[PDB]
């Protein structure tokens, strides 16, 4: 404590972006810090900014004085919300040390974009208007803590607007005007002048929050929204008569929770979807999981945990099928068809129905998601994004420099080859039980996806940088023979290569929780091993994003498979 | 039904002229609602098909015109709120059938059709407990 504090005034001025590391207790807390660091470093380096979500997003309005109070339920607070609206004014301390501590306790539990709102008194906040200097200095802590969306008011000083529009970096700007009185209707030219203040300052999104004295004022909002289309518009009324304007809003509807001080009567995530269904935005759809041995699939338990948390009106069930024509005349052609999640004996046959296959569906040769689109159906393979996101959730970087190893030629063998190439492995090394189904994988994959086949034991010594292995042998045979000798000299060159992570193996079989290959890579040569309960979730997480358009609540769907 | 003293006879706007003129020349006092439903469900609420069927109702001296759509999205319910603004000569009933046209049934003043649990129901009209709950959940009550 002696050596740190004397350099705090020389570290925090000589840096144009800050970041905060803390002591993490659980592995979920470690994971959220290294996930919110990637989107931070995708923002402050400037590669891919989060571009203003094109679906129907929402934003949780954290109205707490200190977020260590509601700290365990914060993963339950941020459910269905695609951004976090920190209101910086209503912190108990508006100091630079406190706001950076409250941003520290949210990237540990929520890997979400932060909307840095310093709302002033004339627009409904607890920050004063007469101290302009600590407002300009607060929005500059949003640029330098790497938040995603900064809040610049439009009835603000014009030196503050042109300072957090020339020094914004890659933190996007939302421009707000609020009618606290309610004397403007949505035909007055003051709303047109505020949209043109958003177009002229080159703000990314514009916010126009009115106040509804009748239900007609919600339909005057939607006639303003279709006459003003250049910059995206978060426009919604307030009061207890403007609930249609928050329900019908597309980008960044403010939501709240039971555990938060909801004062501007914002809806919860259940009440927003329940009202969107009763006015006809959603339909009661039916999703299915199809395959021959479907008696213990554990996929309907995952999705039904997410529809319940978000209050969407969908159901997930099973349909035993062996042919693809019974899927089309019992599930697909019905008007309540929502999508499919296709399992093992039917992955190859459902590719004939996708009029738009993704690039992963062509390269792998199996489709496990069939959602309807305009004029046909869309086919995606989310098994590569389950083999991948199981690695990224256990500390492997998304674009690291290591090498891989696919042990087996099973049903998931081709996705694991594809997931290893778009991981960043410079070379994939196939090592199989028997060499019969071996060379077919190289003739059916591009030479860019180099699959150097290991054939002898001396070749294991030339196999370099293997720290992202995947095992997809069936877990019926304890490992022996020619195959065991190939792997044991492969995993031995493990942690000493040090590519920024600990060497990782991912077992792909769900039901054998401790596979013999999971013992040998962990109890002998010290790797991090991941069970196949993690792949069944992360395959289902991207199917949940594809089926519903909504990010799935992870602890609610993880604690639906693990029982 | 005119002879039995019903209060709202219901001609259709696509009826033959010798039946719209026969009913509307001896209605006496029974008001005429003039209907045209889009049963296929492709005409959005900005065609000249909906201006004509409205204008057929004003031309036949109908006291209410009914114009019933079918919603394929939530925009056809907000397309209907702009059609009722432009046409307030005669009283208008205008809603969008289907599961995606529930908002146009909640936001409709004159004679919103409802149904009950002890009746057969095919066009998915809400009850009085759901029409007043959704009108509360969007902030009219």
Numbering used by the authors:
A (entry chain A): 988 to 1550
B (entry chain B): 1129 to 1269
Tell me, in the authors' exact words, what the paper reports.
In the human fungal pathogen Candida albicans, ARO1 encodes an essential multi-enzyme that catalyses consecutive steps in the shikimate pathway for biosynthesis of chorismate, a precursor to folate and the aromatic amino acids. Our activity and in cellulo data suggest that only four of Aro1’s enzymatic domains are functional and essential for viability of C. albicans, whereas the 3-dehydroquinate dehydratase (DHQase) domain is inactive because of active site substitutions.
Nevertheless, we were able to identify a subgroup of particles corresponding to dimers of full-length Aro1. Notably, we did not add any ligands to C. albicans Aro1 sample used for our cryo-EM analysis, nor did we observe any evidence of endogenous ligands in the five active sites, in contrast to the crystal structure of C. thermophilum Aro1 that contained numerous ligands. The Aro1SK-DHQase-DHSD region of subunit 1 is tilted away from the Aro1DHQS-EPSPS region and is referred to as the “loose” monomer, whereas the Aro1SK-DHQase-DHSD region of subunit 2 is nearly parallel to the Aro1DHQS-EPSPS region and is referred to as the “tight” monomer. However, each individual active site is more than 40 Å from each other and each face outwards from the core of the dimer.
